Amino acid sequence: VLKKNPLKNKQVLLRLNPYAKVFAAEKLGSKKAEKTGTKPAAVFTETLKHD
Amino acid sequence: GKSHGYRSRTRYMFQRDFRKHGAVHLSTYLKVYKVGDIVDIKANGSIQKGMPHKFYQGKTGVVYNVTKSSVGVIINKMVGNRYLEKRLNLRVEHIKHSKCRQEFLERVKANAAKRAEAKAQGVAVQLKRQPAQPRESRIVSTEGNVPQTLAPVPYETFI
Amino acid sequence: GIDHTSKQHKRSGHRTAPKSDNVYLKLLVKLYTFLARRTDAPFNKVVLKALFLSKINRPPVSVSRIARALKQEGAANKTVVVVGTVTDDARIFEFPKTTVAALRFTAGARAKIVKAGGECITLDQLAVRAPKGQNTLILRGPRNSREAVRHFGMGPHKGKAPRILSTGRKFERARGRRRSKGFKV
Amino acid sequence: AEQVAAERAARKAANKEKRAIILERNAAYQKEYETAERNIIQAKRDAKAAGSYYVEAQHKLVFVVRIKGINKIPPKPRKVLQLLRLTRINSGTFVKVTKATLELLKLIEPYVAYGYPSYSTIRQLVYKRGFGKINKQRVPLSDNAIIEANLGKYGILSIDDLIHEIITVGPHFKQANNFLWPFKLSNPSGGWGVPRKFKHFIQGGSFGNREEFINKLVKSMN
Amino acid sequence: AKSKNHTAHNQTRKAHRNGIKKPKTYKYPSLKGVDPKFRRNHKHALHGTAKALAAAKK
Amino acid sequence: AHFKEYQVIGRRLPTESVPEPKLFRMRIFASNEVIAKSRYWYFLQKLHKVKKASGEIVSINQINEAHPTKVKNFGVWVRYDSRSGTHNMYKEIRDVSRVAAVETLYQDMAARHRARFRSIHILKVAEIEKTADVKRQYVKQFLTKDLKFPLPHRVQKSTKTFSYKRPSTFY
RNA sequence: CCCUGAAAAUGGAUGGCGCUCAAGCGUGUUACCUAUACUCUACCGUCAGGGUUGAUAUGAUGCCCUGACGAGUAGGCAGGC
RNA sequence: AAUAUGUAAGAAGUCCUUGUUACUUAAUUGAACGUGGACAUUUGAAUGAAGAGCUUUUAGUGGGCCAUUUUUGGUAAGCAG
RNA sequence: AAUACUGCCAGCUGGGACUGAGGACUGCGACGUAAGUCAAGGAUGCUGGCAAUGGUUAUAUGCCGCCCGUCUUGAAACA
RNA sequence: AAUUGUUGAAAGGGAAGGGCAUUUGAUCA
């Protein structure tokens, strides 16, 4: 009789997506990436500022 | 008054190509035409018997009749808000074969060959053609290909 | 607004419910609507759709035509169903036993069937015996055999029965039909 | 007549099993998304580090919205719009990128704005204005049952599966897109951002390809 | 009192309101304009093969 | 808009006849990446026989100022199409960043020569590291030692449409 | 950019008032107002897809469910006073 | 050149064997129609389709204009074409 | 390291306006081990005032609004 | 009914008449 909008009604959101509860529990919307570090090559570094 | 004849405004249409006048090469008369074959129509100026009209120049049609030296072509002409069939008899000279149909038979033969070979094992035949899909990822290496800086040139007044 | 690709609020173009005011016909239409709505056999839907056909769309079916249809292989033990009127043909002499269900039966055709050994039942009885139309065969008469359709689509080089009142000589047989007086059609 | 409880229990058991399969598939899809995004990021990183440049693959999906009315339209672009299912202003559809589709978009570019969509905006669109086409009717999608009933032959049975088929073009992307009614969006909440819409994006307007900038406009209009 | 002579405006729209229809094709096309000898021999061959089929399969 | 420097490196589509096509890099001042790519392609199909359909972009990046907090003198060579013909100019700006300098130059040209962004072409932007090669007086006057200039006739902004005291423009 | 070139008849037109680091001119960025335009909702009509003789219970041309649309001269059809 | 435009992108198809003819060929040599037999995921490029096809009847219409682009006559025209 | 810019959150929350359609249950979901409950296929509870709201017409105010019918590509015309 | 006279009510800076919403006056379940 009436359309309820997901992302605003938690009951409808959970009904549509059963994975929403697990997503909220694990806080997958804010996940820290691996702290890896790589250095660009001197060729690219010089080409960036080569005028 | 006004003039609309059988050969009106065909000065540059019913004209032989440059350095291609004279007789016709003896290859058209050796072509075999059968009922159902798709052929194109291109008028030749040397022969004035059985010449097609201006509208039927460049049109593509099926062969429905075979005669001594002529074939019948069915051409769909758009008059008003409908297409009407036209059965016109033309000489062999002003008619050539169409390579699109031949490419279709070649594709059909390759299609059947792949349907046999691939389905002998039964995995992902994919007999249908696909359009130009977007290019996948690629990596370019600047080993001897260092990008050269380019700048717009100043305006010049060369004569 | 919408750039409509088709006509808006256009009718389906099909006749729903009979245009006639025959009370018995409306009752039969209601019965067959109930059948076709609460069953799954396409025979009920076909019969219901044919019940809405007009007089020109419901040509009579002859007993000779019924016999010809039943002469087919495996059609001897089948119930003939005619949505319309069944007429009597005097050009046939041997009528096999059958079971024909139709709206109206000509007296001569009914007498012929009774004498042969068959019976004349109505659509309601046919539905009662076979709710799903089992072992039935639908017969329709010739629709293009009317004299009013010959004149349709008249044009040059067509020969489509020009609309005339009198027939014979000097009645649309002059120039326009002969090559000796100009052109032929 | 006491079997109503038995059918109720059987229905609950079947629904729970279906929900379990849906949850497993959703978890798999989320893991695949995270893995793909991280893989692209690290591939770019290694290409930068190894003295090279990473040429990203061209986007295979675009979103096209109509920014022009239904008046003063040439017949060929009008026909192309009808074939692309853009008959109302502020109506949007998803398009798989091929040569034919690119040449189709190049013809009705003056009347549409199209760009590469993202997963977040695709999910928001499907959740908010997601409507299906069942019996030539616009039935809203508020349950996975309707989606499974109308798309189970192609392996799609949930709204998350439909979103996955939209974002990643697969074998049944054509049917997945055809099942969805074109999205009827409203005018942008924050405005179009330009004084004249009927100018190219490089020229300062909404007309033309916007690439990744289409996400902001789509979310503002949705 | 001169008047406009000829114009093709709106003719395309008029013809496209009722979509331009390709001719309806059938498996057996019309056999008119065909060589009379070929038609006669085709009739004879058709009678022969019909008789052969009737004699073989009943 | 707020111009940003984008460097774009592109190349022709690889072919079996000529593998590993040459890479061409250009720096463009543009509002966004789409405008930067469009300008890159437009400039490329003016000096080289290439096109978007017969080419691709292998890299696009944004150049940030190394020292955006230092005041610099920039010399810019430009070529523009006027109402009657094409002319070449060299303008000296004083700004802390290349993007700000080119934005100021664009406003200057659009206000003084009625040249639009479709007309102004950035030929070259450079920084004059020695304060002796400057040949423009409006720039030289701001490089003098001990620069002190007042601000006469200060105009204040009032939050009310009526004032009960006669304003003073002292400073 | 501005000025001379540049002169027509009732008294008058960037609409006028008026405006001069403009409220004039080119360009760059935000906020603001609105169409019978767009999204949602309530009602009416039309069309399409359907359910409803397991009833006392009548109008299955009746009732109900879902979706879409609603401009208009000449003109056609349909329902009504 | 661009634009505009015709045809083909399959089951009315392809392939294997062989029945008919008063056509034709030196000739079971070719042509047409065939019988039997083999190939349904992916039926043979993308997209779309309040479904498509067909028949009857008839109201009004047969003075047009304007806008972008191409362009004729004319110096030009709110001129004609 | 921090910060600017862009994009994400199935992160939370403050304030304001419009709407209350449907009418015993039927379905999809959540909380609750379990009873039962819920913001879950369309709003209820409590309380206050009166027994004035509102309908018709005249004037007034802010805005809009050319004379009916025909001929005409063009009507309100000084047709 | 056109037209006209009185009584009672309202308006009237070179027209009257109408539509969108409301105040005021009269009247109304």
From Swiss-Prot, chain A:
Outcome, altering K4A: Significantly diminished nuclear localization
Domain of life the protein comes from: Eukaryota
PTM notes: N-terminally acetylated by acetyltransferase NatA.
Subcellular location: Cytoplasm; Nucleus
Note: There are 2 genes for uL4 in yeast.
Subunit structure: Component of the large ribosomal subunit (LSU). Mature yeast ribosomes consist of a small (40S) and a large (60S) subunit. The 40S small subunit contains 1 molecule of ribosomal RNA (18S rRNA) and 33 different proteins (encoded by 57 genes). The large 60S subunit contains 3 rRNA molecules (25S, 5.8S and 5S rRNA) and 46 different proteins (encoded by 81 genes). uL4 is associated with the polypeptide exit tunnel. uL4 interacts with its chaperone ACL4 and the nuclear import receptor KAP104.
Protein family membership: Belongs to the universal ribosomal protein uL4 family.
Annotated function: Component of the ribosome, a large ribonucleoprotein complex responsible for the synthesis of proteins in the cell. The small ribosomal subunit (SSU) binds messenger RNAs (mRNAs) and translates the encoded message by selecting cognate aminoacyl-transfer RNA (tRNA) molecules. The large subunit (LSU) contains the ribosomal catalytic site termed the peptidyl transferase center (PTC), which catalyzes the formation of peptide bonds, thereby polymerizing the amino acids delivered by tRNAs into a polypeptide chain.
Gene: RPL4A
Full-sequence portion shown in this chain: 312 to 362 of 362
From Swiss-Prot, chain B:
Assembly: Component of the large ribosomal subunit (LSU). Mature yeast ribosomes consist of a small (40S) and a large (60S) subunit. The 40S small subunit contains 1 molecule of ribosomal RNA (18S rRNA) and 33 different proteins (encoded by 57 genes). The large 60S subunit contains 3 rRNA molecules (25S, 5.8S and 5S rRNA) and 46 different proteins (encoded by 81 genes).
An annotated GO BP: cytoplasmic translation
Major localization listed first in the record, in broad terms: cytoplasm
Numbered residues of crosslink Glycyl lysine isopeptide (Lys-Gly) (interchain with G-Cter in ubiquitin): K31
GO CC annotation, single: cytosolic large ribosomal subunit
Coiled coil location: none
Gene coding for it: RPL21A
Record's subcellular location: Cytoplasm
UniProt GO molecular function: structural constituent of ribosome
Assigned keywords, A-Z: Cytoplasm, Isopeptide bond, Ribonucleoprotein, Ribosomal protein, Ubl conjugation
Identification of the protein by name: Large ribosomal subunit protein eL21A
Entries under Pfam families matching the protein: Ribosomal_L21e
Other facts: There are 2 genes for eL21 in yeast.
Organism of origin: Saccharomyces cerevisiae (strain ATCC 204508 / S288c)
Function per UniProt: Component of the ribosome, a large ribonucleoprotein complex responsible for the synthesis of proteins in the cell. The small ribosomal subunit (SSU) binds messenger RNAs (mRNAs) and translates the encoded message by selecting cognate aminoacyl-transfer RNA (tRNA) molecules. The large subunit (LSU) contains the ribosomal catalytic site termed the peptidyl transferase center (PTC), which catalyzes the formation of peptide bonds, thereby polymerizing the amino acids delivered by tRNAs into a polypeptide chain.
Swiss-Prot record, chain C:
Primary localization: cytoplasm
Residues passing through the membrane, by range: none
Origin superkingdom: Eukaryota
A cellular component annotation (GO) from this entry: cytosol
Biological process, per Gene Ontology: cytoplasmic translation
Compartments reported by the entry: Cytoplasm
Keyword Ribonucleoprotein: yes
GO molecular function annotations of the record: RNA binding; structural constituent of ribosome
Keywords: Cytoplasm, Isopeptide bond, Methylation, Ribonucleoprotein, Ribosomal protein, Ubl conjugation
InterPro entries: Ribosomal_eL18, Ribosomal_eL18/eL18-A/B/_CS, Ribosomal_uL15/eL18, Ribosomal_uL15/eL18_sf
Crosslink site: Glycyl lysine isopeptide (Lys-Gly) (interchain with G-Cter in ubiquitin): K115
Cystines in this chain: none
PTM-bearing positions, type N6,N6,N6-trimethyllysine: K49
Further information: There are 2 genes for eL18 in yeast.
Function noted in UniProt: Component of the ribosome, a large ribonucleoprotein complex responsible for the synthesis of proteins in the cell. The small ribosomal subunit (SSU) binds messenger RNAs (mRNAs) and translates the encoded message by selecting cognate aminoacyl-transfer RNA (tRNA) molecules. The large subunit (LSU) contains the ribosomal catalytic site termed the peptidyl transferase center (PTC), which catalyzes the formation of peptide bonds, thereby polymerizing the amino acids delivered by tRNAs into a polypeptide chain.
Family stated for the protein in its record: Belongs to the eukaryotic ribosomal protein eL18 family.
Protein's recorded name: Large ribosomal subunit protein eL18A
Protein source organism: Saccharomyces cerevisiae (strain ATCC 204508 / S288c) (Baker's yeast)
Native organism taxonomy: Eukaryota, Fungi, Dikarya, Ascomycota, Saccharomycotina
Gene, per the UniProt record: RPL18A
Curated annotation (Swiss-Prot), chain F:
UniProt KW keywords: Cytoplasm, Isopeptide bond, Phosphoprotein, Ribonucleoprotein, Ribosomal protein, Ubl conjugation
Covalent cross-link Glycyl lysine isopeptide (Lys-Gly) (interchain with G-Cter in ubiquitin) as placed by the record, residue numbers: K124, K130, K148
Keyword ATP-binding among record annotations: no
Protein name: Large ribosomal subunit protein eL20A
GO BP field: cytoplasmic translation
Its job: Component of the ribosome, a large ribonucleoprotein complex responsible for the synthesis of proteins in the cell. The small ribosomal subunit (SSU) binds messenger RNAs (mRNAs) and translates the encoded message by selecting cognate aminoacyl-transfer RNA (tRNA) molecules. The large subunit (LSU) contains the ribosomal catalytic site termed the peptidyl transferase center (PTC), which catalyzes the formation of peptide bonds, thereby polymerizing the amino acids delivered by tRNAs into a polypeptide chain.
Record's keyword annotation contains Transcription regulation: no
Known partners and oligomeric status: Component of the large ribosomal subunit (LSU). Mature yeast ribosomes consist of a small (40S) and a large (60S) subunit. The 40S small subunit contains 1 molecule of ribosomal RNA (18S rRNA) and 33 different proteins (encoded by 57 genes). The large 60S subunit contains 3 rRNA molecules (25S, 5.8S and 5S rRNA) and 46 different proteins (encoded by 81 genes). eL20 forms multiple interactions with RNA and proteins in the central protuberance, connecting components of core functional centers that are located far apart.
UniProt GO molecular function: structural constituent of ribosome
